[model samples]
Target: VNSFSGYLKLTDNVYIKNADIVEEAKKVKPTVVVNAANVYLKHGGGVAGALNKATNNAMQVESDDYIATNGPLKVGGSCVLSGHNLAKHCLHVVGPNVNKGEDIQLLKSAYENFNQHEVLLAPLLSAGIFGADPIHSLRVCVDTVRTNVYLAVFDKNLYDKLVSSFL
Candidate 1:
């Protein structure tokens, strides 16, 4: 069981996070890996302000090296956007809510880009702008991750639903 009490760091090696996720991921024999990611600026952004950093991270995981974005594109005209170009990693995923119908599809596509067939680890709470309630949030988060997985460090309010969603 991983704790959500920790903070996100740009300098922290993803392998460490991988270690934590892997421990739980094993129970499901996962193929893809997922997490709660926000945006990081200055080549190293933090969390929950932008929605594209996960793409950047996923691309890194795929390639084992980070790729630079065209610069900084907004999720529209409001949020910053960036993604790791998929090189050779298993998967990368981020789900930010967009008012358009395509946002969800875009998210699903992003996951597919990094994860062809693997388990995806994700959080149960909403982190992006249109963040959802626990049940919907967890479902969306889990849905973003591709395979059935262990939803970790979710919001306390949605404990029951989140636990039920863990498959």
Candidate 2:
């Protein structure tokens, strides 16, 4: 079996794994994979770009079409797209940008929108360019997400945080 370290159970169905999101998406073949995406679904660098590339950039083409019709997603907003390469579906979550430190509820909305998938592959949202606090991002992902969530913590530092806190 391939190794995935730092498996800490969050809920009966939710678990955090220090794993790669793109690799996991391919291996686990989740019903859906999420990107902590930009308001425009522009595939600006970071996890958004990574998943976009993994999905053969078809996600980007589809995202462009989706946004053209739906308008840009606001903070805490989300929408689904057909996964072009790996997972069957792709979910784009927009978390608060740099100025909205008080908008954890919006972050909650971001993850909570993932209600309908049986197996969900997601990442730490709002914590990077979005500037959500690491601790807050981790907590909201664990507490608010519904369904079988496989939280992919890609950062070694964040994985350490998970082990220290959840263990």
Candidate 3:
């Protein structure tokens, strides 16, 4: 019901703000940033792609190395890898893919399995191209994170809708 300091505070620590993570990375250096990643941890496109280039491809190299050593991370799990330049570490979280017939519980597990930090930069995983509704992803995010989190929301309409939904 309140939008203070430019973000919607849904809980004691969780909040959503309209932002570009690439831009925020510079502003919030030394914090753990998250990548809404795939099972392979490939920095292909969307949030992953933008962050890939932002971290100067070191993220991808780490991804490659991690995957080679550990194999693909399962759908409901996560892997923490080196951030290279942009952050303290990059938490690669794989969310439910509606394209693969997965649903919200899978997405919820994605958040529940998160190896949290006191401060984290995250995206609305499974929302957008992954096919989960923005509000669903929003609620799951707001509910799961108990630490200080700044969710980087990109979509204009969804940004307002999220604030409205939270209110």
Which of the predicted structures, 2 or 3, would earn the higher TM-score when compared with the native?
3
Segments in model 2 whose C-alpha atoms lie over 4 Å from true places: 1-6, 99-102
lDDT leaderboard ranking: 3, 2, 1
Tens digits of per-residue lDDT for model 2, 12-77 = 767787777888888767678888888889996778888888867888899989889988988888
Predicted candidate 3 versus true structure: per-residue lDDT over 40-113, tens digit per residue: 88888888999999878888888999999999988878988887677888888999888789766888789875
CA lDDT, every prediction?
0.34, 0.78, 0.80
Candidate 3: residue 35 Cα off by (Å): 0.5
Better of 1 and 3 by TM-score: 3
- Residue 79: error of model 2 in Å? 0.8
TM-score of 1: 0.39
Clashing pairs in 2: none
TM-score of each: 0.39, 0.87, 0.90
- For candidate 2, the 10 contiguous residues with the lowest summed lDDT are 1-10
Name model 1 segments beyond 4 Å from true: 1-32, 38-90, 97-115, 125-130, 140-146, 161-167
Estimate the overall C-alpha local distance difference test score of candidate 3. 0.80
**CA displacement after TM-score superposition, residue 29 of candidate 1 (Å):** 12
